[PDB]
Design an enzyme around this catalytic site. Sequence first.
Site, PDB file in Angstrom:
ATOM      1  N   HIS B 125      24.388   2.817 -11.940  1.00 44.01           N
ATOM      2  CA  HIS B 125      25.800   3.165 -12.006  1.00 44.01           C
ATOM      3  C   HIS B 125      26.637   1.946 -11.639  1.00 44.01           C
ATOM      4  CE1 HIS B 125      25.483   7.854 -11.735  1.00 44.01           C
ATOM      5  NE2 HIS B 125      24.844   7.346 -12.773  1.00 44.01           N
ATOM      6  N   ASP B 551      32.032  14.174  -9.972  1.00 44.33           N
ATOM      7  CA  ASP B 551      33.104  14.876 -10.662  1.00 44.33           C
ATOM      8  C   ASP B 551      33.576  16.128  -9.930  1.00 44.33           C
ATOM      9  OD1 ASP B 551      33.207  13.008 -12.741  1.00 44.33           O
ATOM     10  OD2 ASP B 551      31.643  14.042 -13.883  1.00 44.33           O
TER      11      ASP B 551
END
Lengths: 883, 877
Positions: B125, B551
């Site tokens: 990431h 999220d």
Amino acid sequence: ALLLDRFLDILQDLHGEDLRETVQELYEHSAEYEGKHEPKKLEELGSVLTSLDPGDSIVIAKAFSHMLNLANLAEEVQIAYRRRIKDLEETFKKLVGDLNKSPEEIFDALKNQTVDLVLTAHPTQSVRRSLLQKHGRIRDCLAQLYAKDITPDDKQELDEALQREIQAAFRTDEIKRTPPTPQDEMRAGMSYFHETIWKGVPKFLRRVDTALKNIGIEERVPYNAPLIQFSSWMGGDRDGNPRVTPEVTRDVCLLARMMAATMYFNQIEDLMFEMSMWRCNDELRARADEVHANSRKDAAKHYIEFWKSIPTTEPYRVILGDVRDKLYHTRERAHQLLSNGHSDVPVEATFINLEQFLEPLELCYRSLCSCGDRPIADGSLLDFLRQVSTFGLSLVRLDIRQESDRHTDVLDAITTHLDIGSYREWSEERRQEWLLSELSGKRPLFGSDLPKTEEIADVLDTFHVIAELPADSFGAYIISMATAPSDVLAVELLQRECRVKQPLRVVPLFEKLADLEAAPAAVARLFSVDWYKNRINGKQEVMIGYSDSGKDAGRLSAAWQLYKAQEELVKVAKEYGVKLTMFHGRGGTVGRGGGPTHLAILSQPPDTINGSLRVTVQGEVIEQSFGEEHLCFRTLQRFTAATLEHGMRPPISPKPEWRALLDEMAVVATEEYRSVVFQEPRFVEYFRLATPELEYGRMNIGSRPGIESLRAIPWIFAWTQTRFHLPVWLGFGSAIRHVIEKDVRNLHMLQDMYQHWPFFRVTIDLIEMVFAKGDPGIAALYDKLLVSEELWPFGEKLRANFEETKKLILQTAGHKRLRDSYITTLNVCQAYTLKRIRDPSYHVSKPAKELIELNPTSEYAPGLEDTLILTMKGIAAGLQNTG
Amino acid sequence: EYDALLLDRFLDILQDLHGEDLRETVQELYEHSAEYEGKHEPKKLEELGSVLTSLDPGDSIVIAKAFSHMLNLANLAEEVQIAYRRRIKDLEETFKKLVGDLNKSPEEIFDALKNQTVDLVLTAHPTQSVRRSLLQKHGRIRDCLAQLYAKDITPDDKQELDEALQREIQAAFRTDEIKRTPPTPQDEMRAGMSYFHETIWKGVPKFLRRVDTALKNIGIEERVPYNAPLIQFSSWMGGDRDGNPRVTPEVTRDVCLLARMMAATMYFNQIEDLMFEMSMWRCNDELRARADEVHANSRKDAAKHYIEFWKSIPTTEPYRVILGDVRDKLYHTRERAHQLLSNGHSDVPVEATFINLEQFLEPLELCYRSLCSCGDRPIADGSLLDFLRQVSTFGLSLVRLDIRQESDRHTDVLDAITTHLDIGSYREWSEERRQEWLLSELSGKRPLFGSDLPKTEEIADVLDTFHVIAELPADSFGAYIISMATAPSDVLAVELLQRECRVKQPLRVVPLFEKLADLEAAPAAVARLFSVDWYKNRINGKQEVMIGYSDSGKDAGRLSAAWQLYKAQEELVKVAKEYGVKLTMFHGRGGTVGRGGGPTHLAILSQPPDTINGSLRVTVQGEVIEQSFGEEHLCFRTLQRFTAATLEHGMRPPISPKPEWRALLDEMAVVATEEYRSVVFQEPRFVEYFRLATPELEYGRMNIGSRPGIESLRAIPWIFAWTQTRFHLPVWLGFGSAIRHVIEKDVRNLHMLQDMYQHWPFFRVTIDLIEMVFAKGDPGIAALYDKLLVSEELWPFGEKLRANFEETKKLILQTAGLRDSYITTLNVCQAYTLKRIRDPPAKELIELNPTSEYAPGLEDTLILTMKGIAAGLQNTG
């Protein structure tokens, strides 16, 4: 004391309380002998050894041997630590202060100084490498333990580690059951590179740099300055060793080359990672752009890192990336050439030159320095540079050695097949004239149809192997038993005639006393040949052996004649304007020219080194001087410091009275030596009985298959095991006593000589050390147990002279630990075991699950031979010397 | 004392590279920043900015470089000081506390420790701000600093280490810190795996040895089983293709063959030394017979391709015989992987290599049994044990690779399949139809599609990834994670696509619930999946489900997200227990608290009780890889804290929430989400203000990863934007109105919050994390960004937020009862630089960016500011 209880706890955990108790008792009796020095104790000790079972005796010898080794590692750790909590810096300060020499003089002489260390596989390494590695792990654990930053659990884990490593060492059979091959010897030798020397050299150079900056020299040692070099005999010295075939030499050359390639390849990827700068010159810019033009936009998936084409933003990575390509292909080629007899790899894809390698790295260095990044350049890039310019494409240049008589056999076949006479029967003059006419001629000599013997084909095939292999993989061709220029010209002719493209230098080896006395005359006659002086290019190397010199004559006479030889060889070279570099064949034991290195260098005549030295490292000494980081550093340290001082601080030249005195003294010494070792007709008989000489070959150390007619190595070994050391001190007694008898003021002159002439001081001090490692009661025991009732007084005569000599030594010098206990124990066990071996009664694909089944092909009793080998190993370990 | 030493050292080098003038300007900036971080007078900020405006373009670039590198040096200083202060006095503490406090016995600790697994999975990431070329230099620098912070320095060693540290700092400063092109996924996987053949490979055996020492300090002479999977390593590098089309199937092949070749190389480098050690002659009848077998087919040959042991090994040393065969098979495994990678095929016979995970293990296990049986157990528990654990931990491919893909792509594939089969359109089908059809095809024996199926580039992407999975060894893969999974049909779709692509050993399927709506309804979906008897009968009582954290706190509040995560874990465990399935939960935690980051042991303790049970799986987001495995001590502390926390959470259950706390946190969560969406979604001018007051838009300029409406943005730059400005809006937003509403409804609820913070671990951890984030925040910075970049118009908007900030902080504490100078400098430089951004070979810094749409020296300065601020806060996103 810590090593003892640790070991005994393991031994008890493996063999019970009873056997540990017996070892303890043996230690106590041995302690009473090394303390009160009552000889009765020895017999009192021997009794306890007679009861021992066949397997139990093996366990006992194993135990005291391993405790000796542990004592050695303890000694090394304690020396390193006691030294660390406190030489080069001292040498520099003394050269500046004492001798008024300036820093730039030290730096200039240091640049032009070379120290060529050449490793040999002479069979003196008693401990097998399989166990030597375990020794390394043990000293590693001990070094981490002898410290005060232990975090509890770390101490416990290191305890378990040291315990399992001792247990592993004791659980290996210490006896080589088959002798090694020359390739195995070369492997054992080179193992010290990819573990210690490879990383030790850059660190040493960095330390020299630090000292130089402590003298005010901001400049650094040039990367191409050959301060230290490494040569090898492993696989090249075939003198008296037919197992060194030409195919063996090919094997060791391709081997060393492949090791070197592997090392460079492992280094280069990290070096690519570091050089992430973007500033460069116009030069490196243009070169990197060149590489990026032929960048080969490919996947390049055979590498793990940097498999994408390297961008020009980081130019150092471009250039070093090309370096990586050529290193990968050099390694692949060497690997295929070694494994198979051939390679499809293009030669242009590899590094063929010694400095095709250096060129790109030199360029990166110039770039970093020019753009202000010199600190970066003097880091990993500089370390890598020095590694290249020190080890080259093959870690060591290989020497070849061969006795002259084999070359003479070849030439004799050549002249007989050519129907021109017989080279053997020819006088020296004829040899010189013919050889010179052939060397200057242009017509080939022998042909394919030359009738050759297996020996003749051996030497010719060695020359063909030298011709087939790269020139930078070889060193010098040393001629054993060389006496005339015809032998050197013979090797030059054989080289050129076997199509050796770049012939290597020829170097004579003078080892017998007769050859050393007349060596300067012969070398001068060789320089008199104008063709040879014109090919030699002002540089000549000559070897000076130390083993056999003190074997046929006295130790003193040999030492003195060695000094004179060096001095007059330098005189001849100066007379012909040739830079002479002398090759010292020193051993590990003082009997073969051993001793502390700096004392050996100081005991050389002044102005005989001059920034060029070459010294052998006999097998066992390799582990002694390169088995650890600290040992290796102390090695390059001691060599370079001693050589540098001997260059700027000349030893005192002997006064003429000292010359005549040592000449007479040498005469008396040689007569005294040969009086007891050759004139006495029963001496060989007594020698083969009072020492374990005959059994030396049982250790299987090396690959090599009349007392005058034996090797020097087991000669020093025999009198070293019995701790008598006869060849070391023999002549000195009668020498001194005759000198004080002839004149009483010669006592005042001996006192005068010991305190000002370094050669004499070093010699006497060595003899005193050897006496500190001796004990006549041991030799007395060997006599009483193994020498017939007859010539018992013979040894006593020697024992008399023994003490007689020692009293004289200290009288010139003005003079009036615990491991010896184990050594004494092993001595007694060796004597009794030898008495049982030389007895008739005890003379004789399954697995083995106890010690007695480890020797199934033993002519002697089941447990006896292994015990004998164990005794020799252990005694050699305790005395820190084999032969 | 450490930071001052790093300062004067660095400034001396900077003066030696750019003159006194620039070093003096750096000093001035340090002094002004010190007066701001001290007196907190906002005037100083403008007082600083003036000095930055005069700076030349190259001079300004050098300034940003300077404070960035000084921040990095501060990080390395912090790490060395922590390691030393810790060494000069946890597992021992955990064991002693488990025995004393909870009356638990040592054998219970040993049994639970054997059956415990902690799966650390490394991800690429894009949160690693520093480029690898510079990270290595950082490693060398912390090495020098560690060797210096000691009192056994031998004078010349200290001087040489000074030269080394000086040349290494100069080397780092002489490298371009800006990645000029983003990496490829292969490069990401390489950067990730570099920590193996440098730290993890040798770190794992040492860690296991330390566990053995502690166990013996509790009275357990027995050792940890070598095959006990206490820790494992998985990877996403080259497998996670969700939203990253650059992760092609050929990329997955590349990273699998790559990792396999790395593993083979490492084992081969170890094996020759291990052969050197095993020189014993005692063995069982077993090892005797096996060694005799190998010695029969010993191949009496030259064997000149090895350096050592090229002669046929004699039976006198049997361990060397067996390990010699191990070496032969390892050499051919390495050669096979190398040829397979380099060209794409191999002439090496497969039978000549190790194809099984434990064909490798068998001979070594035999050596172990032999040594132990013959009394040489200490010898076996040494290098052989290290090697055993290395094999049984890393296998033939260092990491098992996960594959991740969004459900909609699988749906596209199936729709092409049903359309081509003229049976309907899978997309338009209801859930029921999908389940029935997929089940009928899964239980059927007839092939589905054929060679002539019309495929799109996307369809061919997923199908070809499955073909690559089929062509490669099964033990090189981990799990197939489905993004945006909502029904069992999403899982069954992947099961069918796997079987139909002739995947011999299909890998496990795992859903990823990351959005709050998916977490609220996840237990229902997993229960429906377990209700399908065919799937429950194939799953073999083991199921893994991933729970994302990024999220969740993006569309709803941070508090609401955390609480919903807790509830989710709890009810998933309830469902799995209800179906007799061992559930192992996969926590997609980030590095920053906004994406579920924070201290690892606090994250593990803040999980509901009886939800791990000796099986844990946690991601390691890029930057956290260096944070937790960049040094020996770091790696050790990582495995330490993970296994200790998990073990305690297994034997020491956290308190279950009282019902009043449940209802209270539900109400509180309602108020929190309303408070959050009130300012981040209801305000229509909020996006306008966000794209101006934060450097969010410029994030992609760092080129960290290979991945090409605020509701519609990634969570990573969302946390990045408010982290750089040191405002941290997504971390504390909802908490204010939540707490204030809870005390408003009832006054004794203050006593109940006071009660909750001191007994419920989840609440305590949440509040304490919020307090840390407040300790790393400063509203004056956001005020400066508003004053410099937000139009005079909606200035009060930010002030409203600035109000809530302080208000919320006052609430947080009410429940709970040096580098910042450089960071401030970089903040001012960033704000002014942005204000100048909105206005209209190489032999110096300005020539490093030739293709810059902005002014010559500006873009590099901006990237430098972001890098440096992220370094100072020890967090990017």
